[PDB]
Structure formats: structure tokens, C-alpha cells
Design a protein around this ligand. Structure first.
Ligand code: 76L
Ligand code: ZN
Ligand code: ZN
Ligand code: ZN
Length: 243
């Protein structure tokens, strides 16, 4: 039939908002209604189980010798409080919103235009050794978990955001993504964050190459929708030249 502009609609029962992830009571209420994802423990930093030459005034922009090596400045930066290269320390995350997708579960979207190489969010979680990782892989497989939340930090340390993390756990995989991870040194400790790899317009889902599952043994249908989607996520090997 003939379509028309819908009337204004105001919700009766109040809206669930991003600040509600820092309000356990309201989040648990929202989750019962399917208005927010299943509760998890929101953490501010990972749980474990260098002076640039910038002139004091962008403060520590693209030419900063720390930034170029993916090292954050300290409080002793020549730019002091105005240093722009302390984004993980100051939790200077992008304006993001959590969305419910048709096929992949929840996801993250940009709420403003994000230029290329914008810091989105730190990927926080429990940092596991190989023994704890192997135990939890078996635990989650036995539990028939639908979603995975592991990401390698270093050759002997895997971050697990299944139980504890932040909204970066909702990032979905795309075969043609608009974000990547970068591993930065902050006060001598490696931390990992999501960064855009192109300009991402306001309203766009943020996506990345989920390497942990992509090169894992088992596979699942890929719902990314990309023009050149590889069809499934998982069961792939990186390029090699054999014999
Ligand atoms: C950032 C790191 O923690 C990984 N984040 C989860 C997001 C789960 C979130 N959606 C939810 O609802 O909590 C990855 C899982 O999401 C699924 N997912 C993603 N992108 C898919 C695709 N393109 N096709 C199918 N499933 C896909 C899959 O289960 C993956 O392990
Ligand atoms: Zn600098
Ligand atoms: Zn600085
Ligand atoms: Zn795909």
C-alpha cells in the first residue's frame, strides 16, 4: 500500500543508553527486555591472572617520535596535559553505540564520522596464559558458546573478554573491514585497541578482520554482507608456499 511519513513515536518505558553499561541495575533490567546484551563485567583495564622531541604548543601529532613507534607519551610529555598521544591512558574512545544486527548478534557502530586511524576502543579483558586459555577453550566449547571473545596480545598471552571486558567485545568480523587492531606500549605494557583504517561515516557498523577465528580449525557461515565475502569465517590458512 501507499506509504506515509510515520507519526512521532515517544517510548513509554525509558530508553536504554550507553551510560547504562556503567549502571548494573538498569542494564540488568534492559537485558531482560532484550534492549541490551547479556550482562558481563565491565572493566576499565586488563586483568592479569620514552621522551619525544615535540615542541611544546596538534600536540604530539603525526610526527611525534613516540606515536611513530606505537608508544604512548607519559605525564612528562613536553605538551603536558595537552598531549594527544595518551589515548589509551585517558580512555579517549570514539563516539560508539551498540546495535542489534539481524544475523551476527550485537555489534558496534560509529555515532560520528571517524577519520582514518581514529582510536575506537581498547580491547580489554582477562589476560590468560596458555594453560588458562586451553582450559577455557574446552570450557566454552563444552558450553556450546555461540560467540567468541579471544584475541592474541602476544605469543604467550591471550585476552579473553568473554566474562570481563568492555563494549569492544561486540565488534563483528567483516571480509572487507573498516577497523584493525594496533598493539601499543603504554608505560612499558602492551595493550591492544581498535582503530579505523578509513573514514567511517556516522551510523556505519564498525568491523574488523577477526584473525583469531578466521585461521582457526572450524568454520561458520559469514554474515558480513561484503561484496567479496569469503562465505565462511574460519577454516582458512594464511598464504604459504609449500615444500
Ligand atoms: C571483538 C571480539 O570480542 C569478537 N567479538 C564477537 C562479537 C559477538 C557479538 N556479535 C555478540 O552478539 O556478543 C565475535 C563473534 O560474533 C559473531 N560474528 C561476528 N562477525 C560475524 C560474521 N561476519 N558472521 C557470523 N558471525 C559473526 C561470531 O560468533 C564471533 O565469534
Ligand atoms: Zn610527542
Ligand atoms: Zn606527548
Ligand atoms: Zn564475510
Amino acid at each position: 500500500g501507499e506509504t506515509s511519513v510515520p507519526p512521532g513515536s515517544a517510548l513509554v518505558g525509558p530508553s536504554c543508553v550507553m551510560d547504562d553499561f556503567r549502571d548494573p541495575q538498569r542494564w540488568k533490567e534492559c537485558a531482560k527486555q532484550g534492549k541490551m546484551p547479556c550482562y558481563f563485567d565491565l572493566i576499565e583495564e586488563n586483568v592479569y591472572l620514552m621522551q619525544c622531541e615535540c615542541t611544546p604548543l596538534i600536540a604530539c601529532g603525526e610526527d611525534c617520535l613516540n606515536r611513530l613507534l606505537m608508544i604512548e607519551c607519559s605525564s612528562r610529555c613536553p605538551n603536558g596535559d595537552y598531549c594527544s598521544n595518551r589515548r589509551f591512558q585517558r580512555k579517549q574512545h570514539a563516539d560508539v553505540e551498540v546495535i542489534l544486527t539481524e544475523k551476527k548478534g550485537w555489534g558496534l557502530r560509529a555515532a560520528k564520522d571517524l577519520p582514518s586511524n581514529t582510536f575506537v576502543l581498547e580491547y580489554c579483558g582477562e589476560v590468560l596464559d596458555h594453560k588458562e586459555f586451553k582450559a577455557r577453550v574446552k570450557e566454552y566449547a563444552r558450553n556450546k558458546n555461540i560467540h567468541y571473545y579471544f584475541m592474541a596480545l602476544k605469543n604467550d598471552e591471550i585476552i579473553d573478554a568473554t566474562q570481563k571486558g568492555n563494549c569492544s567485545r561486540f565488534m563483528n568480523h567483516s571480509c572487507e573491514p573498516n577497523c584493525e587492531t594496533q598493539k601499543w606500549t603504554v608505560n612499558g605494557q602492551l595493550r591492544v585497541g581498535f582503530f579505523t583504517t578509513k573514514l567511517v561515516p556516522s551510523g556505519s557498523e564498525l568491523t574488523f578482520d577477526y584473525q583469531f577465528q578466521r585461521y582457526g580449525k572450524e568454520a561458520q557461515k559469514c554474515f558480513c554482507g561484503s561484496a567479496n565475502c569469503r562465505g565462511y569465517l574460519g577454516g582458512e590458512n594464511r598464504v604459504s608456499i609449500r615444500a
